Design a protein around this ligand. Structure first.
Ligand SMILES: CCCCCCCCCCCCCCCC(=O)OC[C@H](CO[C@@H]1O[C@H](CS(=O)(=O)O)[C@@H](O)[C@H](O)[C@H]1O)OC(=O)CCCCCCCCCCCCCCC
Ligand SMILES: CCCCCCCCCCCCCCCC(=O)OC[C@H](COP(=O)(O)OC[C@@H](O)CO)OC(=O)CCCCCCCCCCCCCCC
Ligand SMILES: CCCCCCCCCCCCCCCC(=O)OC[C@H](COP(=O)(O)OC[C@@H](O)CO)OC(=O)CCCCCCCCCCCCCCC
Ligand code: FES
Lengths: 677, 252, 93, 128
C-alpha cells in the first residue's frame, strides 16, 4: 500500500510504447519494422503480461485490504479546470483490469497466428496495444474527464479495428457506422458529464459519491434535469454495450478480424458501458427514474438480441447478437441495482464468449482450406456442418463455451444467470418471466450454433451436394472398360436412351440440342479436409477453457470483495427445453441420442409446413433485416442527413453564395448597361 | 497558411479589438454571436457531405471549427476565451495539415471529386495514415488538441455567468450535435478517397508514396497537436493571465 | 498529500493530489527545442531525394508545382493537337 | 389432366457419369418452391435446415435453380430474382419467386436444381 499505488500510473502506459514504435516504424521505415515482424508481437504480449501481473497484485491487495486509492496528479491549472488524470483503484478497477489484460494477452497469443498470413500485421498490433492502453486508462480513471478522454480513444480504436481490412468497402461502411454510433454515445456522455458538472461542479469520481447523497434534497436543482442528465449519461453505455437504440454498429463489426470480435465485444469495450454504469451506480440509485430506464432498455434489447441470433447464416454475426443479448442481460442486472451479480455475469460472459469467438475463428481458419477465402463461404455457419470428426479441441472449447452460456451448473457457468433470475423475480413480475424466456431462447440459439457447426455431416464435402466432389472421388466409372473407353458431353437424355414414346403432351423433342457437359476427374483431387490449427490458436482456447471452468464455481467472496432448488431447476428446465428444441431440429438422425419413434413423430406431427411457413418466415425476416431497424436507420437517419446535406449545400451554393456572386453579377450588369446608355 | 493563420486573424481581432476595446457592446451582441456560432457549426458540418469536391469539405470543415472560436469568444468566461485561443492554435495546425495532405493527394491521384477516386490507401499508405490521424485530430478526438479545445469551449458554455440554463441546454445540445456531424463528413471523406478497391489499379500505375519531405510536414504538424492534446498547458499557460485581464473588464 | 475521504456510500478514499506544472521556463524550452526540430527537419528533408516530385510522372507531363497544371495540360494539349491537325491540313494531310 | 412435365435434373452426377433425372408430376403452377417441397425433390441443398430459408418470401437466394428451356411457361422476374442473384448465367431463378403459371398448362421445362455446387455447364443454345 505504501509504495505500490504510487506506481499505479504505469498500467495504461506500459502497453503504449510498442504502438508508439510501430506508429513511427511502419509510417517511416516499413521494410525495417516489418522485417522485425514477430518481435513486436512478443513485446506487446510481454508488456501486457507486466500489466497482468501488476493488476493481479492490485487485485490481491483489494481482496486482502478494503481501501481505494485515487492517485491523482495535475493536468491543467489555469482556471476552474484544475484538471486531474488520476487512477481510481476500486474493486471494479481490479475486475476490469484483469478483464482487459487476460483477454488481451489471450487474443494476442491468438493473433500471432491469426495475422501470421496477413500483410497487415504490425498496424493491427499497434491498434491492439493502443486499444489496451486506452481501455486500461479508461478503467483506471478518477474523473469523468479521463473517462471521456479514453472513451473516445476506445471509440477511435474500434473504428481502426473494424476498418482494419480497409481494402474491402463493406468494412468501410462498417467502421464508419461504428465510429458514428460511438460518437452518438459520445455526444450523450459529453452533455451528461457537463450536466453533472452543472448539478455538482465536481469533475471527479471522489466528490460525486458524497454530493449525490444529498444533492436531490436541494431546491435549486431540478429532478427533470437530473433524470435527463442521467439518461444522456446512459446514452454512452448504449453505444458501447450495443443497447437497443445504438445497436446497429455491433453486427457490422464482423467484417474486421475475429480477434476484434473477441475484444471489441465479449471483452473490454462492451464492458466499458458496464464499467461506467456500475461505477456511477452511487449516482444512479439516487436518481429515481433512470434505474427503470436502464431496466427498460435492457429488457427491450434482450428480446432483440435473442431473436436476431436465431436465424443468422454467419457464425460471427450470430455470436455478435449473442454477445449483444448477454450485454442486455448485464444492463438488466444494472437496472436491478445489483452491484455484485452484474459484474460477475460480466466476468463469466467476457471469459466465455471470448472463448467462443476464438473457437469460431478456429472453425473459420479450418474452413479456409476448404472453401478458399470468403466470408460468405468461410464464415457461413450453414455449410460448416460438422467439425467434431476433424477439429476435436476446437469442438471441446466451443462446447464448453456454449454450455457456459446455456447455464449448466457442474461443468459450466450457471450461478451467474441463477443470481440474475433470482434478483429478477423478486423485483417486478413483468421483467422476470420474459427474462427466463429469453434465457431459454439463448440456450436455443447457442445450441443451434453448436449443432450447425460441429454436429452432423459437413454440408460442403457431402456427396449429395457437391458435384466436383462426386467428380473427384470417382476417378473411374462403374464398368471399367465398358460403355466408353473412359463419357463427356452427355446429351439431353430425357428419354434415358429407353426409346420412350410420347402420349398426348406438349413436346418431347424440339430444336433444343443441349448436352450437359460435365467436368472431369483426377485434377485437384485431394480436397484437404479441415485439419487442426497450430498451437497459437489452441493455447488461448485451452487457457480460456481453464478460465470458464474456474470462474464457473465462484462462505464466498461475494460480500467481502465488494428458493434454491426450484428456481435453479426451472432455469435448467427452460434451458434444456431450448437444447431439446434445437436438438430435434438440427441434430441428424444417425447421431442423435433420442428414440427414433419420437424422432419420426417430430416430422410426422409437422410435415405440413403451413403453420410453420409463417413462423419461420417471420423469424428469418426479423434476423435478416435486423428487426428493420438497420433499414430504418439507413433510410431516415443517415439518408436524412444526406438529404439535409444536399439541401444545405443547395442553400449555401445557390442562395447565400448566390447573393455574394450576384453583387458582382449586378456590378457587371450595371457596368455593361451604363456603358451602352 | 490561408487556413492555418490567415483564417484565425479576425478571430484574433474579435479577441483583440472586439473584446478589450469594446466590452459592453460585445456583451450586447455575444448573445447573438453564441446562437450564430451554434448554427455555424451545424451548418458548415452539414454543407461538408454535400461537397463532392475534396478540398471544399476541408474548407467547410474549417468554417465548422471556427464556430467553436466564435462561441468561445462569445462565452464571456476565461474557459470560453481560453478555449477559443486554443482552438485558434489547434485548428491552425489541423487545417494547415489537412489542406497540405489534400494538395498532395490531388498531386498524386489527379482526381478532385469523390464519386471517383475510390480506394487509394493501398496505393499511398503514408498519406493515408497521416490523413487518417489528422482526421482524428479534426474529430476533436483525444490525444489531439482539437479535443481539449472543444471541451474547454463546452466548459466555458457550462460555466457561464452571462447565460442561464434555458439557453445553456440548447447551446450544449446544438454544439454536441456538431461532434456527431463532424465524423460523418470526415469518415465519408476517408471511406471515399482511401477505403475500397478498384480492379483497374493493380500494377501499371504504381503511384509514388509520401516522400520524406511531405512526411516531415505531416509529422511536424502532428507532434504539437499530440503535445497539446496530452498536456494542454502549452497554450493556456501563455494566455490565461491576459484572459484574466480581459475578463476583469467584463465581470465588473 | 495523504487525505482520507469519508463517504458513506462505498468505501474510504486515499487521494494523493500531486499538483504540478511544467515550469514556465520549460515551456519556452520545449518550444525552443521544437523550433530546433522544425529547423533541422525543414533543412534536412528539403535536402532529401523527393521521390514523387522529381520523376517523369510529375515533372514530365506538366508539373509546375501548382494545382492547375493538370487542367492547363488537358486544356492546352487538345489545343496542341488541334494546332497540329490544322498544320497537317495545311499540307493536305 | 393438365400435367406439366418437370424433369428436375439433380446437381451431382451419378458415379457412372450420367445425370439422374427424376421427372416430377405436380399440377399446374402455384409456386415452384411449393412444388419442390411437396413432391420431395431437393431444392435448397445445404439450406434445407428449418431456419436456413425465408419460408418462401424471397429474402434469401437459397432456393436458386438453373432452369433450361424455361422461356415457355414461366412468370418473369419479380425484381427479387433480378436483385438477390445479380451476376449469374441468367438462366438461374428463385423457386420462391418464379411460377410456371396457370393450372391449364402443358410443357417440358427442365430444371437443374442447385446451380451452386455443380460441374456441368449444359451447353445452352444461343437465343435469337
Ligand atoms: C520522429 C522523427 C520523425 C521525423 C520525420 C521522419 C521522416 O519523415 O523521414 C522518413 C525518412 C525515410 O523515408 C522513407 O524512404 C523510403 C524510400 S525507399 O522505398 O526505401 O526507397 C520509403 O520507405 C518511404 O518513402 C519513407 O518512409 O527517414 C528519415 O530520414 C529520418 C531520419 C532519422 C530521424
Ligand atoms: C464589388 C462588386 C464586385 C464586382 C466585380 C465582379 O463582378 O466580380 C468579378 C468576379 C468574377 O470575375 P473575374 O473576371 O474575376 O472572373 C474569373 C475569371 O478571371 C476567370 O473565370 O466575380 C466574383 O468573384 C464575385 C465577386 C463578389 C464580390 C463581392
Ligand atoms: C495519444 C493519442 C495520439 C495518437 C492517436 C492515434 C491515431 C490513430 C492511428 C490511426 C492510424 C490509422 C491509419 C492506417 O490504418 O494506416 C494503414 C497503413 C497501411 O499499412 P499496411 O502495412 O496496410 O500497408 C501496406 C499495404 O499496402 C498492404 O496492406 O499502415 C500504417 O501506416 C501504419 C500506421 C498505424 C500506426 C498507428
Ligand atoms: S426460400 Fe428463401 S429463397 Fe426461396
Amino acid at each position: 500500500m505504501e509504495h505500490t499505488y504510487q506506481y499505479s500510473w504505469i498500467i495504461p502506459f506500459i502497453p503504449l510504447p510498442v504502438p508508439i514504435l510501430l506508429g513511427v516504424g511502419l509510417l517511416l521505415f516499413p521494410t525495417a519494422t516489418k522485417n522485425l515482424r514477430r518481435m513486436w508481437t512478443f513485446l506487446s504480449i510481454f508488456l501486457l503480461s507486466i500489466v497482468m501481473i501488476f493488476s493481479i497484485y492490485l487485485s490481491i491487495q483489494q481482496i486482502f485490504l478494503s481501501c481505494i486509492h485515487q492517485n491523482v496528479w495535475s493536468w491543467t491549472i489555469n482556471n476552474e479546470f484544475s484538471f486531474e488524470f488520476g487512477y481510481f483503484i476500486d474493486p471494479l478497477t481490479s475486475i476490469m483490469s484483469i478483464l482487459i489484460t487476460t483477454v488481451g494477452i489471450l487474443v494476442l497469443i491468438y493473433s500471432d497466428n491469426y495475422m501470421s498470413h496477413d500483410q497487415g500485421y504490425l498496424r493491427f498490433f499497434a491498434y491492439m496495444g493502443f486499444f489496451n492502453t486506452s481501455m486500461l486508462g479508461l478503467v483506471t480513471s478518477s474523473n469523468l474527464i479521463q473517462v471521456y478522454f479514453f472513451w473516445e480513444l476506445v471509440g477511435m480504436c474500434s473504428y481502426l479495428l473494424i476498418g482494419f481490412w480497409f481494402t474491402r468497402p463493406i468494412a468501410a461502411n462498417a467502421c464508419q457506422k461504428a465510429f458514428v454510433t460511438n460518437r452518438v454515445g459520445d455526444f450523450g456522455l459529453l452533455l451528461g458529464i457537463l450536466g453533472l458538472y452543472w448539478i455538482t461542479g465536481s469533475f471527479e469520481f471522489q466528490d460525486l459519491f458524497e454530493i449525490f447523497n444529498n444533492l436531490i434534497l436541494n431546491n435549486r436543482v431540478n429532478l427533470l434535469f437530473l433524470t435527463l442528465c442521467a439518461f444522456l449519461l446512459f446514452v454512452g453505455p448504449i453505444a458501447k454495450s450495443a443497447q437497443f437504440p445504438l445497436h446497429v454498429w455491433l453486427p457490422d463489426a464482423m467484417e474486421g478480424p475475429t480477434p476484434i470480435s473477441a475484444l471489441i465485444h465479449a471483452a473490454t469495450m462492451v464492458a466499458a458501458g458496464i464499467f461506467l454504469v456500475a461505477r456511477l451506480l452511487p449516482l444512479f440509485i439516487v436518481i429515481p427514474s433512470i434505474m427503470y430506464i436502464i431496466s427498460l432498455i435492457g429488457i427491450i434489447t434482450v428480446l432483440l438480441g435473442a431473436t436476431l441470433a436465431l436465424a443468422q447464416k454467419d457464425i460471427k454475426r450470430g455470436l455478435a447478437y449473442s454477445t449483444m443479448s448477454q450485454l442486455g442481460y448485464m444492463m438488466l442486472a444494472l437496472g436491478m441495482g445489483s452491484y455484485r451479480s452484474a459484474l460477475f455475469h460480466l466476468i463469466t460472459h467476457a471469459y466465455s464468449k471470448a472463448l467462443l469467438f476464438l473457437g469460431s475463428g478456429s472453425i473459420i481458419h479450418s474452413m479456409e482450406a476448404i472453401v478458399g477465402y470468403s466470408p460468405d463461404k468461410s464464415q457461413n455457419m450453414i455449410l460448416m456442418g460438422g467439425l467434431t470428426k476433424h477439429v476435436p479441441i476446437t469442438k471441446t472449447a466451443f462446447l464448453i463455451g456454449t454450455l457456459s452460456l446455456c447455464g449448466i451448473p457442474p461443468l459450466a457457468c450457471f450461478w451467474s444467470k441463477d443470481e440474475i433470475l433470482n434478483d429478477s423475480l423478486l423485483f417486478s413480475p413483468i421483467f422476470a418471466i420474459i427474462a427466463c424466456s429469453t434465457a431459454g431462447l439463448t440456450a436455443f440459439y447457442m445450441f443451434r450454433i453448436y449443432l450447425l457447426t460441429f454436429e452432423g455431416h459437413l454440408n460442403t464435402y457431402f456427396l449429395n451436394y457437391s458435384g466436383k466432389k462426386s467428380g473427384s472421388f470417382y476417378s473411374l466409372s462403374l464398368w471399367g472398360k465398358e460403355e466408353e473407353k473412359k463419357l463427356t458431353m452427355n446429351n439431353t437424355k430425357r428419354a434415358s436412351f429407353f426409346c420412350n414414346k410420347t402420349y398426348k403432351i406438349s413436346n418431347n423433342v424440339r430444336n433444343q440440342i443441349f448436352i450437359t457437359v460435365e467436368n472431369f476427374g483426377l485434377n485437384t483431387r485431394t480436397f484437404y479436409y479441415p485439419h487442426e490449427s497450430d498451437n497459437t490458436i489452441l493455447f488461448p482456447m485451452l487457457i480460456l477453457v481453464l478460465f470458464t471452468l474456474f470462474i464457473g464455481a465462484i462462505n464466498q467472496e461475494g460480500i467481502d470483495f465488494d428458493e434454491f432448488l426450484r428456481n435453479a431447476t426451472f432455469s435448467v428446465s427452460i434451458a434444456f427445453f431450448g437444447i431439446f428444441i434445437a436438438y430435434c431440429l438440427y441434430k441428424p438422425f444417425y447421431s442423435s441420442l433420442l428414440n427414433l419413434t419420437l424422432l419420426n413423430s417430430f416430422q410426422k406431427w409437422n410435415s405440413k409446413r403451413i403453420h410453420w411457413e409463417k413462423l419461420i418466415n417471420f423469424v428469418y425476416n426479423w434476423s435478416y433485416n435486423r428487426g428493420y431497424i438497420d433499414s430504418f436507420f439507413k433510410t431516415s437517419l443517415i439518408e436524412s442527413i444526406r438529404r439535409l446535406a444536399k439541401q444545405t449545400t443547395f442553400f449555401d451554393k445557390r442562395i447565400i453564395d448566390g447573393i455574394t456572386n450576384g453583387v458582382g453579377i449586378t456590378s457587371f450588369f450595371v457596368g455593361e448597361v451604363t456603358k451602352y446608355i | 497558411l490561408l487556413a492555418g493563420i490567415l483564417l484565425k486573424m479576425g478571430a484574433y481581432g474579435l479577441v483583440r479589438i472586439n473584446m478589450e476595446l469594446l466590452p459592453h457592446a460585445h456583451s450586447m451582441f455575444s448573445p447573438w454571436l453564441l446562437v450564430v456560432g451554434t448554427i455555424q457549426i451545424i451548418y458548415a458540418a452539414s454543407t461538408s457531405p454535400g461537397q463532392r469536391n475534396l478540398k471544399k469539405r476541408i474548407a467547410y470543415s474549417s468554417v465548422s471549427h471556427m464556430g467553436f472560436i466564435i462561441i468561445g469568444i462569445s462565452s464571456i468566461t476565461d474557459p470560453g476565451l481560453n478555449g477559443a485561443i486554443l482552438q485558434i492554435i489547434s485548428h491552425g495546425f489541423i487545417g494547415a495539415a489537412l489542406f497540405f495532405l489534400a494538395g498532395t493527394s490531388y498531386d498524386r491521384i489527379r482526381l478532385v471529386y469523390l464519386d471517383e477516386m475510390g480506394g487509394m490507401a493501398i496505393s499511398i499508405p503514408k498519406i493515408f495514415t497521416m490523413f487518417t490521424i489528422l482526421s482524428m485530430a479534426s474529430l476533436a478526438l483525444p490525444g489531439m488538441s482539437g479535443f481539449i479545445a472543444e471541451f474547454i469551449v463546452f466548459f466555458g458554455i457550462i460555466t457561464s455567468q452571462k447565460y442561464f440554463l434555458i439557453s445553456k441546454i440548447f447551446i450544449i445540445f446544438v454544439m454536441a450535435i456538431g461532434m456527431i456531424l463532424t465524423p460523418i463528413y470526415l469518415l465519408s471523406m476517408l471511406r471515399q478517397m482511401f477505403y475500397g478497391y478498384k480492379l483497374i489499379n493493380i500494377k501499371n500505375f504504381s503511384f509514388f508514396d509520401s516522400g520524406p519531405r511531405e512526411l516531415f510536414l505531416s509529422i511536424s504538424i502532428l507532434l504539437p497537436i499530440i503535445g497539446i492534446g496530452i498536456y494542454p498547458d502549452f497554450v493556456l499557460s501563455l494566455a490565461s493571465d491576459k484572459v484574466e485581464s480581459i475578463l476583469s473588464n467584463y465581470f465588473y | 498529500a495523504v487525505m482520507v475521504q469519508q463517504i458513506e456510500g462505498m468505501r474510504d478514499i486515499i487521494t494523493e493530489k500531486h499538483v504540478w506544472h511544467l515550469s514556465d521556463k520549460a515551456i519556452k524550452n520545449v518550444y525552443m527545442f521544437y523550433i530546433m526540430f522544425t529547423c533541422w527537419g525543414c533543412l534536412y528533408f528539403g535536402s532529401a531525394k523527393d521521390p514523387f516530385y522529381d520523376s517523369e510522372e510529375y515533372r514530365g507531363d506538366g508539373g509546375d508545382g501548382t494545382g492547375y497544371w493538370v487542367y492547363e495540360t488537358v486544356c492546352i494539349s487538345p489545343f496542341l493537337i488541334l494546332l497540329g491537325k490544322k498544320e497537317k491540313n495545311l499540307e493536305m494531310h | 389432366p393438365p400435367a406439366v412435365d418437370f424433369a428436375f435434373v439433380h446437381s451431382v452426377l451419378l458415379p457412372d457419369g450420367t445425370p439422374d433425372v427424376h421427372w416430377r408430376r405436380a399440377n399446374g403452377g402455384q409456386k415452384l418452391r411449393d412444388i419442390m417441397l411437396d413432391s420431395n425433390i431437393e431444392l435448397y441443398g445445404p439450406y434445407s435446415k428449418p431456419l436456413s430459408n425465408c419460408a418462401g418470401v424471397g429474402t434469401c437466394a437459397t432456393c436458386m435453380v438453373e432452369i433450361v428451356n424455361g422461356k415457355e411457361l414461366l412468370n418473369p422476374r419479380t425484381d427479387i430474382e433480378k436483385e438477390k442473384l445479380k451476376r449469374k448465367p441468367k438462366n438461374w431463378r428463385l423457386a420462391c419467386q418464379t411460377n410456371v403459371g396457370n393450372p391449364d398448362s402443358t410443357g417440358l421445362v427442365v430444371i437443374q436444381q442447385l446451380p451452386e455446387w455443380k460441374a456441368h455447364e449444359w451447353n445452352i443454345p444461343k437465343n435469337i
